[PDB]
Copies of this chain bind each other. A is one copy, B any other.
Amino acid sequence: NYPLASSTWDDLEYKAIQSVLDSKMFTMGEYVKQYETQFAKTFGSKYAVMVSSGSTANLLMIAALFFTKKPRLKKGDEIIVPAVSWSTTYYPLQQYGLRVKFVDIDINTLNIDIESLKEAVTDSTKAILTVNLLGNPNNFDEINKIIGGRDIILLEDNCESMGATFNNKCAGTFGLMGTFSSFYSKHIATMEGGCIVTDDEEIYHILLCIRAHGWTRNLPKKNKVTGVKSDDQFEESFKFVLPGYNVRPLEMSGAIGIEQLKKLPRFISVRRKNAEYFLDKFKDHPYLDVQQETGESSWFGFSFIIKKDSGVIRKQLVENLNSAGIECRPIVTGNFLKNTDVLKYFDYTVHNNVDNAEYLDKNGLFVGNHQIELFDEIDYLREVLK
């Protein structure tokens, strides 16, 4: 009836695939490169680099920081994160030996709690990795006040908020790097795909290098990694300079991404209209609280949190929902801190408490928002959730 996922494609995505077939160049090329230019232009960054998925976009984002001429991050370094996000926002911190400090979320915005942030910040903090949750941007104004010129890097996992903006700027472009995802279920889809954006050329060349074999084949003759490239191909083409990966996207995802980006503004427009109608139907709801928007959210989906002491039990709504053909799931993955089994591999600490994440973990659920008009579905959802 009402799924969490619908297809974003049309004839056009298919044609783009044909175009690629007909070219007989399958691995990362023209399209991918064209696609990166469009992406950057699209969100207002100087550079964009396409990878195999948003997870690997997070991996290189952290990785790159260790290979700047003046390494910006080091093993043991303290990084702050919020307690609610996708797993692969965290894994990379572990794989790089960072010390992780979790902070609770604000139960209204579902983003990192600001007042906890303020106090959680110190002289030991090297970086802050924010996540724009469910399409909702962090209030970067306040985040910038809290950092206050200190050597603390700001990073964004924007895998759920493509299109969101805050004060006339695209989410994802506030940090030194911002990551995106074009996985099937996201604002657009290239089957799998992710992207890192940055206005830093140094970081930009490093990303080009660790994305594919740690080589220099995709570096420009004069570049910020090696500096000046020899002209002996026999030579230059087989020099390895950073311990990277092969996380190249396929040409086909680049081509398909070109088509989706064209459609994006409409997708976002439809999404917001549905959000507007949704909020109208659900405000002053007797036992559910909705997400409070910051800036202009790209409304990835619709979260609900059971009102305190309303005596409503999640299992029930859950049943209700499914019995009406409406799919739902926890919000993102609930409180990450409960995954104690993977947590045993981390060097981590919890600032103050994560009561909010905890409450969410037991009392929130989520239903999708899509790029097609869902007025009908919402009216029904509201009939079911009364």
Contact = CB atoms under 8 A, between A and B. Distances in A.
Contact of A87 (B17, B237, B240, B318): B240
A26 B184 contact: yes
A166 interface: no
Contacts of A192: 27, 246, 248, 250
A334 B238 contact: yes
Which among A184, A192, A246, A333 has the greatest number of chain B C-beta atoms within 10 A?
A: A246
Given A27-B184, A184-B27, A55 B87 contact: no
A14 B22 CA distance: 10
Interface stretch (A168-176, A261-269, A337-345): A337-345
A244 B58 CA distance: 12
Given A88-B213, A95-B95, A184-B26, A242 B342 contact: yes
B7 A14 contact: no
Nearest to A212: B55
Given A214-B87, A234-B330, A246 B56 contact: yes
A245 interface: yes
Indicate the size class of the contact surface on chain A: 35 or more
Contacts of A56: 245-247
B246 A345 contact: no
Nearest to A213: B87
Contacts of A26: 184, 191
Contact of A55 (B14, B240, B245, B334): B245
Contact of A339 (B241, B246, B251, B330): B241
A234 B24 contact: no
A151 to B, nearest CB: 23
Nearest to A333: B238
Contacts of A183: 27
A94 B251 CA distance: 29
Contacts of A240: 87, 333, 336, 339, 341-342
Nearest to A27: B184
Interface string A179-218: 0000110000001100000000000000000000111000
A372 B139 CA distance: 60
A241 B88 contact: no
A13 to B, nearest CB: 10
Interface in A49-71: 52-56, 59
8 tightest CB-CB pairs across the interface, nearest first? Answer: A55-B246, A26-B191, A87-B240, A240-B339, A53-B246, A238-B333, A241-B341, A91-B243
22 contacts: A7-B24, A14-B21, A17-B17, A17-B21, A52-B247, A53-B246, A56-B245, A56-B246, A87-B213, A88-B213, A90-B243, A94-B243, A95-B243, A192-B248, A192-B250, A226-B341, A234-B329, A240-B336, A240-B341, A241-B339, A242-B341, A242-B345
